[PDB]
Amino acid sequence: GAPPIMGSSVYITVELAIAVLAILGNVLVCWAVWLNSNLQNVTNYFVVSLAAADIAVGVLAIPFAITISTGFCAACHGCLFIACFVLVLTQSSIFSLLAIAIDRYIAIRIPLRYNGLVTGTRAKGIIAICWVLSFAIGLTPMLGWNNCGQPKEGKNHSQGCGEGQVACLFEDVVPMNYMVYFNFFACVLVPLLLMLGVYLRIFLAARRQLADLEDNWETLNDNLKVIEKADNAAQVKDALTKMRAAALDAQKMKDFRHGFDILVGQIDDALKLANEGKVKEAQAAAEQLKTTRNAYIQKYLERARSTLQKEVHAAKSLAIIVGLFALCWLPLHIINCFTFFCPDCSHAPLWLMYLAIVLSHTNSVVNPFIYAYRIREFRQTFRKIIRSHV
Ligand SMILES: CC(C)CCC[C@@H](C)[C@H]1CC[C@H]2[C@@H]3CC=C4C[C@@H](O)CC[C@]4(C)[C@H]3CC[C@]12C
Ligand SMILES: CC(C)CCC[C@@H](C)[C@H]1CC[C@H]2[C@@H]3CC=C4C[C@@H](O)CC[C@]4(C)[C@H]3CC[C@]12C
Ligand SMILES: CC(C)CCC[C@@H](C)[C@H]1CC[C@H]2[C@@H]3CC=C4C[C@@H](O)CC[C@]4(C)[C@H]3CC[C@]12C
Ligand SMILES: CC(C)CCC[C@@H](C)[C@H]1CC[C@H]2[C@@H]3CC=C4C[C@@H](O)CC[C@]4(C)[C@H]3CC[C@]12C
Ligand SMILES: Nc1nc(NCCc2ccc(O)cc2)nc2nc(-c3ccco3)nn12
Ligand code: NA
């Protein structure tokens, strides 16, 4: 009924509004990573590659998505590039998110070998090998998995296109078995479940390790209570062998390697008294541990539970990015499955189709907002840039 120019004028104005915020937002992220030296870690090299794929949305993907909506006349091998360039961009964001999840898992499971396993020179190479495979995954329709060989000649004659030209529409050049099996299932859904399995192993490793330092502290504070309330030298010997193993395993620096060394010294000095026969002398040597327990060991566990809880806060922030990438791209993929798995169902309405395309494009703006709300370093560099560069 209504002229298609009225409906499409709403779409282009909304598309150009997303392109403005996708270039303005992610350019502040890339600018802060090179303006600040605290943001130049390996984890943020994948953040830049994520923002570089969200800048390309406002430069190429959104302008391409407008042209394909008009259904203009184009060669069926050129119409594929306008249609499938987004699939390369979505494939790079998935590979970057997957690299951030394993980067945070290597740092939480192996904190003493991170600086040797995960280096910047190796990260720049992993990024280059992901972009190549992103073009191989997103542009593999052009390799021969097309509907170009089966043209809709009813729409090509009405449009009045040339020889070898097809009315350039998305669902008329790339088949749906590619969008559901290869694109959604094998290349989007499986890596999404892997990030959910990697992140669950991050909060599980931290939750087990947060309980270990408190179990050790509980062991060192109550076995000490057994010493001053003991009636035998062997009862003091038993409590010390546990306090020596628990402390040495609490050890697994700045006053760290010194105060813990005072603990093992006083313990082993009280072990020779209990094994010799002097009970009252060993119970007095164990009270010397209380001072070190309130000066060095209390300040080690205080910082260990502080650095381990911030890795819980930081991993939760990056996990929301995986949750917002799915909430913005699954609605478009679910409509695809209805079109392919239920031929008896009617197609989704066009207002819902372009609602799923616009929503999937709004994913290029949410990421710089998560950094400014849940990362203090990014929130301060941004404020430093906006106030100074004005
Ligand atoms: C910043 C740079 C890389 C952007 C330039 C790439 C763009 C503008 C180029 C590269 C490939 C080109 C497309 C490939 C083939 C065709 C088929 C033709 O019948 C209509 C134009 C169309 C659809 C071209 C439009 C312009 C195009 C999309
Ligand atoms: C959190 C996110 C994933 C929620 C996604 C909700 C969307 C993608 C779901 C919820 C209800 C679904 C719709 C329910 C029924 C129909 C009618 C059918 O003839 C076409 C598909 C269509 C229109 C479905 C498309 C997908 C749909 C719109
Ligand atoms: C959080 C992630 C895993 C959600 C994944 C949802 C996908 C894999 C599932 C959830 C609901 C499912 C759809 C629900 C109903 C129908 C209608 C039926 O006639 C054909 C299959 C179809 C279209 C299903 C296809 C697969 C489907 C879209
Ligand atoms: C982990 C794996 C095994 C489960 C997830 C795969 C699911 C979501 C996919 C894989 C194969 C798909 C099915 C393949 C074909 C059909 C027949 C069609 O008439 C109804 C939809 C239906 C039934 C699809 C529904 C969704 C489906 C079951
Ligand atoms: N199904 C689909 N359609 C479109 N646009 C075509 C909109 C349309 C759909 C039907 C119709 O008759 C006329 C126009 N863009 C699309 N992008 C995607 C997509 C991108 C990433 C994953 O799925 N799926 N998708
Ligand atoms: Na992206």
Curated annotation (Swiss-Prot):
An example Gene Ontology CC term for this record: presynaptic active zone
Membrane topology designation: Multi-pass membrane protein
Gene Ontology terms: biological process: adenylate cyclase-activating G protein-coupled receptor signaling pathway; adenylate cyclase-modulating G protein-coupled receptor signaling pathway; apoptotic process; apoptotic signaling pathway; astrocyte activation; blood circulation; blood coagulation; cell-cell signaling
Record topological domains on the Extracellular side: 4-9, 69-79, 146-175, 342-349
Localization, UniProt: Cell membrane
Binding positions (adenosine): 171, 336, 360-361
Post-translational modification note: Ubiquitinated. Deubiquitinated by USP4; leading to stabilization and expression at the cell surface.
Molecular function terms, GO-annotated: alpha-actinin binding; calmodulin binding; enzyme binding; G protein-coupled adenosine receptor activity; identical protein binding; lipid binding; protein-containing complex binding; type 5 metabotropic glutamate receptor binding
Segments on the Cytoplasmic side according to the record's topology features: 35-44, 103-122, 201-317
Keywords for the protein's UniProt record, in alphabetical order: Cell membrane, Disulfide bond, G-protein coupled receptor, Glycoprotein, Membrane, Receptor, Transducer, Transmembrane, Transmembrane helix, Ubl conjugation
Residue pairs linked by disulfide bridges in the UniProt entry: 73-161, 76-148, 79-168, 342-345
Keyword Chaperone attributed: no
Family (UniProt): Belongs to the G-protein coupled receptor 1 family.
Free-text comment on this protein's domains from its UniProt entry: The cytoplasmic C-terminal domain is necessary for targeting the non-ubiquitinated form of this protein to the cell surface.
Function: Receptor for adenosine. The activity of this receptor is mediated by G proteins which activate adenylyl cyclase.
Name used for this protein in its record: Adenosine receptor A2a
Biological source species: Homo sapiens (Human)
Shown chain mapped onto the complete sequence: 2 to 307 of 412
